[PDB]
Subunit: 104 residues, 3 copies
């Protein structure tokens, strides 16, 4: 089963102007759900405007979601950002109180 | 021991108007500490205003904290949000430099 | 190898006025990359302004990065904040599509 039967958090920091394309890519890969945070950052003094996108996934392989975001967020210039995958141990839907991988 | 002797991050995305009730519920369950982030999101094009609540816990079972948030954040309409539990490997209190589960 | 050959997320919640000193400390320890989020919180009703700093690390020990942040963020008064270390399972550089610990 995808994600070894578990749940993963895909966290991407990307350019603000690529958010629209990332949203479209996520919808197209079948994992439209996302939470966006406005952030500031630097990679390798003054911080630049960035966007954090978070997608918790279970049914869709986390590497597939990461690839979709990366392809949509890419420009080829320094500052394009990074995607990280973190383990999630449980999930609860607030509306129903449903828990586990099927809660999403 | 609670949380199998470890530390967990409870991350909830909820409606902004439910934050006050969630804060009260967290205080009542004995885990008042929280960090709030203003975010935007969609579940299953335009993003809606949401709130992210993060609570790192050790002494209080993470599922108890999650249940408290879910009950307070519930309305029964689509958009109520989700709660995720993630593993935390260590914690440090900045004021004292105390580390581990007792750092909170 | 550092971080047991893996990748870690160091997440710190600190006073806003300490961000400049934390940035300098991170550069000095050799891990300048960071993402900053403006947040609100309380520790142990009204929430106070705080800053969340996130640093994903592989080459630099996560406890070294945490110590650098803690020392720079310290004042000795309640409200100084906390640092948490979370596991990260994978990373992707958007610009190159490079993956794994060497993606950072
Ligand atoms: N290791 C990291 N930890 C936390 N945030 C990072 C990390 N690497 C990159 N970021 C975030 O992604 C943004 C762009 O990073 P990146 O494209 O690596 O910058 P650069 O090309 O200048 O090294 C940064 O401004 C920061 O917000
Ligand atoms: N799998 C997920 N990953 C990231 N964020 C999510 C996920 N599911 C829900 N969210 C967040 O919670 C909010 C409300 O979600 P939800 O109640 O599931 O919406 P819906 O009922 O329309 O499917 C979303 O707008 C988003 O911010
Ligand atoms: N267990 C926790 N979970 C989530 N956020 C926390 C936690 N502990 C502290 N914080 C964050 O760090 C900030 C400062 O915390 P802290 O210095 O512990 O406050 P206090 O000294 O009043 O207990 C809080 O306002 C909150 O944003």
């Amino acid at each position: 089963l995808p994600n070894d039967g578990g749940i993963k958090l895909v966290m991407a920091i990307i350019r603000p102007d690529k958010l629209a394309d990332v949203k479209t890519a996520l919808a197209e890969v079948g994992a439209p759900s996302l939470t966006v945070t406005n952030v500031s950052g630097r990679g390798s003094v003054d911080l630049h405007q960035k966007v954090k996108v978070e997608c918790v996934v279970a049914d869709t392989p986390a590497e597939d979601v990461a690839d979709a975001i990366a392809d949509a967020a890419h420009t080829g210039e320094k500052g394009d950002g990074k995607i990280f995958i973190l383990p999630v141990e449980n999930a609860i839907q607030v509306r129903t109180g449903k828990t586990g991988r099927d809660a999403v």
